[PDB]
Each structure stands twice: as structure tokens, then as C-alpha cells.
């Protein structure tokens, strides 16, 4: 990550952009596995093997409360969603596939956000 991403505090205008990025992901057709915390009745071992769970509703709560001080911290929570999924599930499962698609979409939107900050 470049210096701006790591060091530049998030302003109120930056927060309007983060809200837009998050809503784009929540509306994506392949976001269904990630919208809410994993239900342990569906996956009884999940919370024994994933030490730091994350989901898009937790990120929305954090954005509303202004939890994030730097863009790097927002990117780290999002990346945890996808990395947790690829560690828990095998590479041929539909959950793994959804992580591949949605991470590529996140990178496209994140590049758009970074461009808009500087110019
Ligand atoms: C293997 C058990 N069968 C099953 O479908 O349970 C789940 C439920 C949710 C997830 C999930 C969503 S986000 N990443 N992991 C994975 C497995």
C-alpha cells in the first residue's frame, strides 16, 4: 500500500466513499455467504478453527460508528472476510468461488475510491 493509504486519516468525505463501497459489495449477487456472521448451527466447528471472524454487517456497524482511522484498517477487515473463507472451505466449494469473485470486485471498487481521494 502507498503512503496515503497507510498514513492519511480518514475524513468525513472519505467516509461517504467507504459507505458507497460497502453498499456495492452488499448488493453483489455473490455476497450472500458474507452478509451476516456465520451461523454455528450450519457449521459447528467454524468458531473453533477461525480465530478472528468477520462479515459485512460487522463492517457496516464499524463504518457507522467511525471505528476506522486509516484506509489500511478498513482494507484489513475486508481481506479477513475472504482469507477466512479460503482457509475454512476447500478450493472446489461454492463458498470459495464466491470469495474469489467478490474479492476481485472489491479491488476494482477500492482502486476507484483511492483515485477519487487524490483528484
Ligand atoms: C460445511 C458445512 N456446510 C455448510 O454449508 O455450512 C457452512 C456455512 C457457512 C459457511 C461460510 C460462509 S462464509 N465462509 N464460510 C461455510 C459452511
Cβ partners under 8 Å of residue 73, min gap 6 = 67
**44 C-alpha to ligand 1 centroid (Å):** 10
1 neighbors 93 (Cβ within 8 angstroms) = no
Number of independent structural domains in the chain: 1
* N-term to C-term CA, the chain: 18
**4 C-alpha to ligand 1 centroid (Å):** 36
In angstroms, the Cα distances linking 26 to 6, 50, 56, 117 are 25, 22, 7, 22
Cβ partners under 8 Å of residue 27, min gap 6 = none
Q: Which helix (H) or strand (E) holds 80?
A: helix 71-88
83 neighbors 103 (Cβ within 8 angstroms) = no
Q: List own/partner pairs for 1-9 with CB under 8 A and 24 or more apart.
A: 1/71, 1/72, 1/75, 4/71, 4/114, 4/117, 4/118, 5/70, 5/71, 5/72, 5/75, 5/114, 6/70, 6/71, 6/72, 7/70, 8/70, 8/71, 8/117, 9/69, 9/70
Q: How far is CA 106 from the centre of its chain?
A: 8
99 neighbors 25 (Cβ within 8 angstroms) = no
Query: Which protein residue has the closest C-alpha to ligand 1 atom 2?
Result: 43
Alpha-carbon dihedral angle through residues 51, 48, 104, 95, given to the nearest 10 degrees: -170
Q: What gap in Å lies between CA 31 and CA 17, rounded to an integer?
A: 19
Expressed as residue numbers, the domain containing 100 is 1-119
Q: What gap in Å lies between CA 23 and CA 60, rounded to an integer?
A: 9
Pocket test for ligand 1, best of 36, 38, 78, 100 (most atoms within 8 A of CB): 38
Write the CATH number for 12: 1.20.920.10
Cell of 99: 470469495
Amino acid at each position: 500500500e502507498d503512503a496515503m493509504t497507510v498514513l492519511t486519516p480518514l475524513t468525513e468525505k472519505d467516509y461517504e466513499g467507504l459507505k458507497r463501497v460497502l453498499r456495492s459489495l452488499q448488493a453483489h449477487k455473490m455476497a450472500w455467504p458474507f452478509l451476516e456472521p456465520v451461523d454455528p448451527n450450519d457449521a459447528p466447528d467454524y468458531y473453533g478453527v477461525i480465530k478472528e471472524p468477520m462479515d459485512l454487517a460487522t463492517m457496516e456497524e464499524r463504518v457507522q460508528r467511525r471505528y476506522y482511522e486509516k484506509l489500511t484498517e478498513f482494507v484489513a477487515d475486508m481481506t479477513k472476510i475472504f482469507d477466512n473463507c479460503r482457509y475454512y472451505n476447500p478450493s472446489d466449494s461454492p463458498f470459495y468461488q464466491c470469495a474469489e469473485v467478490l474479492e476481485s470486485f472489491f479491488v476494482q471498487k477500492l482502486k476507484g475510491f483511492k483515485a477519487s481521494r487524490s483528484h
